[PDB]
Design a protein around this ligand. Structure first.
Ligand SMILES: *[C@@H]1O[C@H](CO)[C@@H](O[C@@H]2O[C@H](CO)[C@@H](O)[C@H](O)[C@H]2NC(C)=O)[C@H](O)[C@H]1NC(C)=O
Ligand SMILES: *[C@@H]1O[C@H](CO)[C@@H](O[C@@H]2O[C@H](CO)[C@@H](O)[C@H](O)[C@H]2NC(C)=O)[C@H](O)[C@H]1NC(C)=O
Ligand code: NAG
Lengths: 491, 496
C-alpha cells in the first residue's frame, strides 16, 4: 500500500521514516508462479515480484533442492520484548504514530509478530529498580502489586498489540530479580541467589510470586503461554553483576523447579502455562539440560529450553543446540533474547546489523529452534533509556522531538521470516548442489505451501535455481548483501 | 631472597611493591634428597611463592582426594613461557630509573625471577603503540629499498631484548607477528578496517609482503637478534570485519593457505633465515579445527607450517576439547602454542591492582592448555601503566606488572605469581605426564617431568574451601598436603 520513505544517517544503508500520518505497509499467488520479496543494502524494502516456475533446468550453476519429505521442527513464532523502555518510548509518540508503530509489528499489514516477552518487574531497560513485593519479609505477599510501569505502559500496549494482530499472540514472562529480602546479598544486582534451600519458605514464596504475577495480569484479561524459570541465571553467580539478576547453578534450577515452581504452578488456576528452563547463553548447553532433565521430578515440569545469543559473536550450533535436541528431542528449543550494539549502541541504517539478525534466525532454524524473540521492541537514538547505561540497538528507533520513528534494516531482516512463517510452519530439507556463501532455509505452511529465505552475506551476485519436485525450477539471482523470501503453491 | 612488600588497592588480594632498590626475589632453587619434596605457595590472603619442605613417606595417612603420578603416560614437551615486548611495555619499563628497570627485567628473565624463555615482538605498530607506522611507509617500493626500523625498535624494543637475554641463564626464543602491512599493499589503503592484500597469491603484492618478513629478520640480525619463529599474521580474521578499529590484515583460511604455499614459505626457505619456524592462525581457537583443515590438508602449505598459534581472548565461545583436542587428533604432529594469553568484564576497569580472580584465570587457562596438548604461552604486554596504557585506541586489558612512573615504583599483580608457578618450575624440554584423580574434585592440577626426570605438580584451588590432598609417586610414596581455598601450589621432588 505505501512504500519506504528512506533516510541516510551516513552508514551502510537507510532507515524507513514513519510519523503520525505516514508509515510503509503491505496490503495482503497462482500455481505455476512464485512470489519473491527483496530487501537490499542499496535501499529496497520487501519489494514484491513474481516469476514463472520452469518445467526444466540445465547448468553448472548453484541449485537448492527442496526435500519436502525430510520434516524437522514446527514453528512457535517471532516477536520481541515489551520492556519499560520500549513501552515508555512508544507512548511518548502522539497516538496516531503509536498506532502506526504497533501496526508495523503486529498487523497483517506489518510483519506479523505473534510473540511478546514481558519482564516480571524491572530490568536494565527500566528507569528504576522495583519488584512487585518490595515490603521486607512479606512472605505471604500481602503487599504484592503491579506499579504504573505494568498498569499504564506495558498492559495497555499489549492489549492494543493483540487487537491489531489477527494471529493469536503468545505472551512469555521472565523475571530478572526477586525481592531483595529473598536473596543472600540483599540487592537487586551483584552475586546472589535465593536464601536457604529448595523446598523452604524463601523458595516457596518466590514460586508463589510467579502465581501472583499471573493472577494480576489475568485480572487485566491477559493470559501467558509460558514463563522462564529465571532470566540469565548464570549472571547472578558473577561478582559485581551490574543490573537485576538472581543466581542459579543448574543443580539449584533443577531443585527449584522440582521442589517449588513446578508443583506451585501445577496446583494453581494457571496450570496450562508452560515452563521454559535456562533462558541464557547456548554455550551452557548441553550441560544445563543434562543436569535438569535427567531428573524426572524436574523434567515433568519443563516444556522447553530458552536460549539467548549476542549477535556480534559466532559459536558452534551443532555442539550446543544439536546435541541438546539429540539428548532431549521432545523438549523444544526456543530463542528468547538476542541483540547487537553496546562499537556504538545505535547505528541508524546499519545493513550489517540486519544481516546479523537473519543469519542468527537461519542458524537457529537449521538446529531445531521453534521460535526467535528480539529484545526491546523500540529504543531512543541513545539506545535507552537504561538505568545502568547498558545501551543497545533496536529494530525501531523513536525520535520523540520529531514525533517520528525509524525502521532499521534489522526490522526488515526479521520481517522476511516473521511475515511469511506462520505458527505451525514446519522446516523441511534443502540441499545445496555445491559449496556457496548463501544461508538458506525452507519450511512448509500448515496449508501445504512453500517458503524459502536466502541471505547473501557476500558482495557478489549469485545466480541460483531452487528445485521443488512437485512443480519445477525457480530461476533467480541473489544480489550481494540481499535477503529474499520466496513463496509458492505446491497442490 | 627478599620477600613481597604487599599493598592493597581495595580488590581481593595485594600487589608486591618494587622500586629502584628493593624487589622480591628467590635464591636459586635447590632440590632436597629422595624422600623429601619442596612446595611453593601463593594465596589470596597474601602468601607469594613461600617455600616449605616435607616428607614423601611409604604410609598413606590420607582418606581424601589422591592424585597419582603416571610417569609412563607421556604427552607434549614444553617450549616455554614469556610475554610481549610491545611499544607500550618498552615505554613503561624505560620511564623507570635504570636500577628499577633492572629489577623489573630480573623479575621476568633472571633465575632469581620467574625464568621467562620466550618474547613475542610485534612487527611494527599495533594498538599497544603511540602511533600507526609500518617499516615501509614510502609507497610503490616493491623491492623495499626504503625498509627501516624506527626508534620504537632501535631505541626501546631491541636494547630491552638484549638486556633480557643477558639476564636469562635459559636460552630465550624470539617470536615475531605483524598486525598490518604498509597501506599501499592493502585493498582498503588504511592500517585498520576491512582490508586484505591487493591481488592474488604469487603476485607482486604478495611477494613484497613475504620479502617484508625477510627484511625484518635481516634488520634484527644486524642488531645481533635471531628469531625462533614468526606467525603468518596476527588475528587474520580481524581484517575481514568492517570498521575493525586497529592495525589488521585480513586473510580467509584459503588466502592464508595460498599466501603460505606460494609466497611466505618459499621466500623464507630461499633466505638466510630458512631455520625460522612459521606458525599459522595466531587467532581465536573457535576457528579450529576448520582453519587447520583448510591450511594443513594442502601439502604445498603444510610443508612450511611448524605449528598452530592460538589466542585466549574469546576462549569462552568454544570449549578446549572441540578445538585444541580435535585439532591435535586430526594433525597430531603439528604443535599447538598459545601466542596471546591475555585476560575483562564490561563493568570493570582495564587494570585491577591485586585481583586474585585475574590471576586464577591465567593459571586455570595454562592448566587447560597443558591438558589439551599446548607446548607454550606468550602473555601479552610485559608491563602497562595504571590506566592499562598506552594504547592509541582503547585499554581493554590488564598486565602482570603495572608501572607507576610518578613514584619510580612497579606493582607485581597476582597474574605475575600465577604465571611464575609454571614458568619458574617448568624448563624447556619438560614433558607433561599422567596425573590420575581418585575421585571427582574442584581442583585444577597438572604433572610434568623435567629433562633430568624430577617431578613438578601444580595444584590450583579456585574454591573457598580447603581441600585435603595426597599425591602418590609410585617410585617414592605419598605426599600428605592441603590445597587451601584460593591457593596455588607448585610441588617439586627427585624420583631417585
Ligand atoms: C510525515 O511524512 C510524510 C511522508 O514523508 C510527509 O508527507 C509528505 O509531505 C511532504 C512535505 O514536505 C511532501 O513533499 C510529500 O508529498 C508528502 N508525501 C506524502 C506521501 O504525503 C508528512 O509531511 C510528514 N508529516 C510531518 C508532520 O512532518
Ligand atoms: C624501596 O622500598 C623499600 C622497602 O619498601 C624501602 O626500604 C625501607 O625504607 C625505610 C625508610 O623509609 C626503612 O625504615 C625500611 O627499613 C626499609 N625497608 C627495607 C625492607 O629495607 C626503600 O628505601 C625504597 N627505596 C627507595 C629508593 O625509595
Ligand atoms: C502494605 O499493605 C497495607 C494494607 O494491607 C498498606 O496499608 C500499606 O500501605 C502497604 N505498604 C506499602 C508500601 O504499600
Amino acid at each position: 500500500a505505501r512504500p519506504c520513505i528512506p533516510k541516510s544517517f551516513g552508514y551502510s544503508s537507510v532507515v524507513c521514516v514513519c510519523n503520525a500520518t505516514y508509515c510503509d505497509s503491505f496490503d495482503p499467488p497462482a500455481l505455476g508462479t512464485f512470489s519473491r520479496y527483496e530487501s537490499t543494502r542499496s535501499g529496497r524494502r520487501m519489494e514484491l515480484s513474481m516469476g514463472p516456475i520452469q518445467a526444466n533446468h540445465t547448468g553448472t550453476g548453484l541449485l537448492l533442492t527442496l526435500q519436502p519429505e525430510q520434516k524437522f521442527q514446527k514453528v512457535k513464532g517471532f516477536g520481541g520484548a515489551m520492556t519499560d523502555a520500549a513501552a515508555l518510548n512508544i507512548l511518548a509518540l502522539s497516538p496516531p504514530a503509536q498506532n502506526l508503530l504497533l501496526k508495523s509489528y503486529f498487523s497483517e499489514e506489518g510483519i506479523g509478530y505473534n510473540i511478546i516477552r514481558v519482564p516480571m518487574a524491572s530490568c536494565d531497560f527500566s528507569i528504576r529498580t522495583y519488584t512487585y513485593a518490595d515490603t521486607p519479609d512479606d512472605f505471604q505477599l500481602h503487599n504484592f502489586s503491579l506499579p504504573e510501569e505494568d498498569t499504564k505502559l506495558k498492559i495497555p500496549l499489549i492489549h492494543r498489540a493483540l487487537q491489531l494482530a489477527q494471529r493469536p499472540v503468545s505472551l512469555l514472562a521472565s523475571p530478572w530479580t526477586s525481592p531483595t529480602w529473598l536473596k543472600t546479598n540483599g540487592a537487586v544486582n551483584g552475586k546472589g541467589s535465593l536464601k536457604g534451600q529448595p523446598g523452604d519458605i524463601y523458595h516457596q514464596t518466590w514460586a508463589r510470586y510467579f502465581v501472583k504475577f499471573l493472577d494480576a495480569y489475568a485480572e487485566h484479561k491477559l493470559q501467558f503461554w509460558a514463563v522462564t524459570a529465571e532470566n540469565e541465571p548464570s549472571a547472578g553467580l558473577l561478582s559485581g553483576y551490574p543490573f537485576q539478576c538472581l543466581g542459579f547453578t543448574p543443580e539449584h534450577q533443577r531443585d527449584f523447579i522440582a521442589r517449588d515452581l513446578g508443583p506451585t504452578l501445577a496446583n494453581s488456576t494457571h496450570h496450562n502455562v508452560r515452563l521454559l528452563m535456562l533462558d541464557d547463553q547456548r554455550l551452557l548447553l548441553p550441560h544445563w539440560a543434562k543436569v535438569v532433565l535427567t531428573d524426572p521430578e524436574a523434567a515433568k515440569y519443563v516444556h522447553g529450553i530458552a536460549v539467548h545469543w549476542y549477535l556480534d559473536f559466532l559459536a558452534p550450533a551443532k555442539a550446543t543446540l544439536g546435541e541438546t535436541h539429540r539428548l532431549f528431542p521432545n523438549t523444544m528449543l526456543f530463542a528468547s533474547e538476542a541483540c547487537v550494539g553496546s562499537e556504538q549502541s545505535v547505528r541508524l541504517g546499519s545493513w550489517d546489523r540486519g544481516m546479523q539478525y537473519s543469519h542468527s534466525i537461519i542458524t537457529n532454524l537449521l538446529y531445531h529452534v521453534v521460535g526467535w524473540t528480539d529484545w526491546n521492541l523500540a529504543l531512543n537514538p541513545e539506545g535507552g533509556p537504561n538505568w545502568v547505561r547498558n545501551f543497545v540497538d533496536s529494530p525501531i528507533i523513536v525520535d520523540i522531538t520529531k514525533d517520528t520513528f525509524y525502521k532499521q534494516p534489522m526490522f526488515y531482516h526479521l520481517g522476511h521470516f516473521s511475515k511469511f512463517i506462520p505458527e505451525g510452519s514446519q522446516r523441511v530439507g534443502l540441499v545445496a548442489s555445491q559449496k556457496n556463501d548463501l544461508d538458506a532455509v525452507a519450511l512448509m505452511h500448515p496449508d501445504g505451501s512453500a517458503v524459502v529465505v536466502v541471505l547473501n552475506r557476500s558482495s557478489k551476485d549469485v545466480p541460483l535455481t531452487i528445485k521443488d519436485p512437485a512443480v519445477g525450477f525457480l530461476e533467480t539471482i541473489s544480489p550481494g548483501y540481499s535477503i529474499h523470501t520466496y513463496l509458492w503453491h505446491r497442490q
